[PDB]
Design a protein around this ligand. Structure first.
Ligand SMILES: COc1ccc2[nH]c(-c3ccccc3)c(CCNC(C)=O)c2c1
Ligand SMILES: [Zn+2]
Length: 449
């Protein structure tokens, strides 16, 4: 067997021990691994091919295998008794020595010189804007009670999803770029990949919940007010987060959370299971994007057909808000102006709906800031559209499509996916006037006194 062929067989057998049930499955994997390590010892590496067989740098590689086999014979000693958990622990101790000391020989992967300075700058810029911007969002909702009650309790949950990724996986990846390889343990590796899972999948379901909320508030407005929103939204936020944790659990059994050297980050691997990725691409992207598209399609058609919009009085300047109605004159909140019977008059000057003009040009802050929440979704769609397309190609047939997918395109796709984590408070400030005011209000508060 070749040195390159034996290296691949030694790695996939190490993954078998993690997904193993019986100690016999562990013992079968370690016997296959011990024999593969011995055949690899009597083979010359391609990097140090010009080096002497008894060179001080080649003899050091020979001792590395003896220290690796040394870890295998201790691991099968535990497995022969019956202890699976005790043998899987020694198997990871061998996995750490195989990626740190045996990594000197060979290196099939050749990453371009641009994937390191871009990844680092992008993560620095993302982490910096994320920690400040998304913190201001948390602070603005906690202080202002008007915004908080206007269905923007989900924004705190969406901001927390964005914030957690900047505090734990992003700084470790930045260390992994500068140290060239995952400098942290296997424990921190799978955890970082899991934290990112919550942050991405949890954000999709936070956006959907917002789209359904803004769908039920604009369309079927009267039916909405009949349904309580007091204890309902903290329950919905709790539910979508527990739904995310459930959807992320098959990664632990399949073994899809591993270090990807192409993007220097420990993330989810698309080639680990074509069945699981199919669900991640369809059930956790294509399907929720489609239902959100249906939600905002019904809102934009109402704005286009000039449905519930503000109506200003051409006599006393009374602005009729469909979100408020005219409850004292019998017009319950949620009623459209086109639905109030002709006998209705202005509750200030007493002039009929005949002499009433509509407020042309919709503000982005209007209808629980539907235009701002729409942009948020469109931005999320653009950011995660290429990666889900790459995962879709692998889910169909990775025997020919996976090696054909360029490494450059993968990094470019992953760069957008990370950048999304800081973009949300930027669109809040640019489009929502109330958010813009609150951003200045927090900044001027701690800056002056
Ligand atoms: C449920 O399994 C997990 C588990 C962990 C995951 N981490 C990421 C991810 C994190 C940051 C930037 C881009 C992707 C995905 C999303 C990866 N999706 C695709 C289609 O490749 C992910 C999925
Ligand atoms: Zn009037």
């Amino acid at each position: 067997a070749d040195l390159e062929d034996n290296w691949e067989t030694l790695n996939d057998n190490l993954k078998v021990i993690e997904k193993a049930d019986n100690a016999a499955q562990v013992k079968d994997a370690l016997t296959k691994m011990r024999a593969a390590a011995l055949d690899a010892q009597k083979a010359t590496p391609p990097k140090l091919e010009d080096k002497s067989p008894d060179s001080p740098e080649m003899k050091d590689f020979r001792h590395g295998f003896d220290i690796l086999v040394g870890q295998i014979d201790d691991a099968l000693k535990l497995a022969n008794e019956g202890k699976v958990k005790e043998a899987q622990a020694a198997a990871e101790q061998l996995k750490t020595t195989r990626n740190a000391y045996i990594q000197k020989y060979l290196g099939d992967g050749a990453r371009p010189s641009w994937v390191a300075p871009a990844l680092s700058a992008v993560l620095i810029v993302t982490t910096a804007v994320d920690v400040v911007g998304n913190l201001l969002v948390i602070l603005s909702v906690l202080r202002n009670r008007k915004l908080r009650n206007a269905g923007n309790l989900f924004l705190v949950s969406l901001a927390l999803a964005d914030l957690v990724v900047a505090f734990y996986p992003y700084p470790l990846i930045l260390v992994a770029i500068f140290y060239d390889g995952w400098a942290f343990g296997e424990e921190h590796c799978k955890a970082s990949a899991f934290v990112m899972g919550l942050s991405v999948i949890g954000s999709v379901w936070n956006i959907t919940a917002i789209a359904i909320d803004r769908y039920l508030y604009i369309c079927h407005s009267m039916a909405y007010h009949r349904i309580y929103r007091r204890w309902h939204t903290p329950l919905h936020i709790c539910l979508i987060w527990l739904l995310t944790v459930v959807a992320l659990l098959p990664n632990f059994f399949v073994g899809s959370l591993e270090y990807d050297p192409r993007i220097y980050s420990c993330t989810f691997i698309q080639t680990a299971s074509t069945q699981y990725t199919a669900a991640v691409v369809v059930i956790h992207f294509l399907l929720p994007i489609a239902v959100v598209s249906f939600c905002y399609l019904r809102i934009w058609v109402l704005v286009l057909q000039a449905r519930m919009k503000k109506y200003t009085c051409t006599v006393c300047g009374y602005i009729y808000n469909p979100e408020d109605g005219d409850p004292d004159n019998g017009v319950n909140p949620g009623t459209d102006f086109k639905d109030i019977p002709d006998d209705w008059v202005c509750p200030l000057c007493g002039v009929g709906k005949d002499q009433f003009e509509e407020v042309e040009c919709l503000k982005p802050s209007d209808l629980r800031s539907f235009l701002t929440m729409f942009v948020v979704f469109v931005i999320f769609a653009i950011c995660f559209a290429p990666l889900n397309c790459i995962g879709l190609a692998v889910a169909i047939n990775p025997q020919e499509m996976a090696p054909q997918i360029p490494e450059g395109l993968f990094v470019t796709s992953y760069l957008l996916a990370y950048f999304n984590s800081c973009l949300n408070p930027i669109v809040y400030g640019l489009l929502d006037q109330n958010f813009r005011r609150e951003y200045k209000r927090i900044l001027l508060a701690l800056w002056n006194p």
